[PDB]
Design a protein around this ligand. Structure first.
Ligand SMILES: *[C@H]1CCCc2occ(C(=O)O)c21
Ligand SMILES: *[C@H]1CCCc2occ(C(=O)O)c21
Ligand SMILES: [Mg+2]
Ligand SMILES: [Zn+2]
Length: 157
């Protein structure tokens, strides 16, 4: 399928460990009408490396912004170099295996990805009308305090 979008984002680890600290990984993200996939990027040759995972577009229920972290490290705090080193703008892709947290280098790039992702899931069956506006961190959602990753969203839209 045709490539709609191709960008380098920071990805928060999902099942690294149940209680261990959260890891953040630099990934090349690809969007087609069929899948949202991510790879280790091969910087030296200027091409995508090994595929590290995928999300079938049909399984996505929600795509929105996330309220940013209160104390972010320099890599996630607000040019050719800045675009591949700082990732301050998070968004969420909600599916069956909880939300995937993605960090964009710019506001414009996040907006573009949210816009296109909303169009590819337009005819999805499982789309929800509620979401969690804040991150799931240290066993709970910061917005509602619910302890289930698959918990129903606390806010409308
Ligand atoms: C990231 C890279 C090592 C293997 C692995 O297993 C789970 C995860 C993750 O959730 O990102 C990773
Ligand atoms: C990211 C999150 C889902 C599980 C997984 O396995 C490998 C990787 C990675 O290396 O990014 C991930
Ligand atoms: Mg630097
Ligand atoms: Zn919530």
């Amino acid at each position: 399928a045709a490539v709609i979008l191709e960008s380098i984002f920071l990805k928060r680890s999902q099942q690294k460990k149940k209680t261990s600290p959260l890891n953040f990984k630099k990934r090349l993200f690809l969007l087609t009408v069929h899948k949202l996939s991510y790879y280790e990027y091969d910087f030296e040759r200027g091409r995508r490396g090994s595929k590290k995972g995928s999300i079938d577009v049909e399984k996505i229920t929600c795509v929105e912004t996330v309220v940013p972290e209160k104390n972010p490290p320099p890599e996630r705090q607000i040019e050719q170099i800045s675009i591949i080193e700082r990732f301050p703008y998070p968004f969420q892709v909600v599916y069956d295996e909880g939300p995937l947290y993605v960090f964009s280098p710019t506001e414009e790039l996040r907006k573009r990805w949210i816009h296109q992702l909303k169009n590819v899931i337009r005819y999805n069956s499982d789309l929800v009308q509620k979401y969690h506006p804040s991150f799931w961190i240290d066993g709970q959602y910061l917005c509602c305090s619910q302890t289930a990753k698959n918990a129903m969203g606390c806010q409308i839209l």
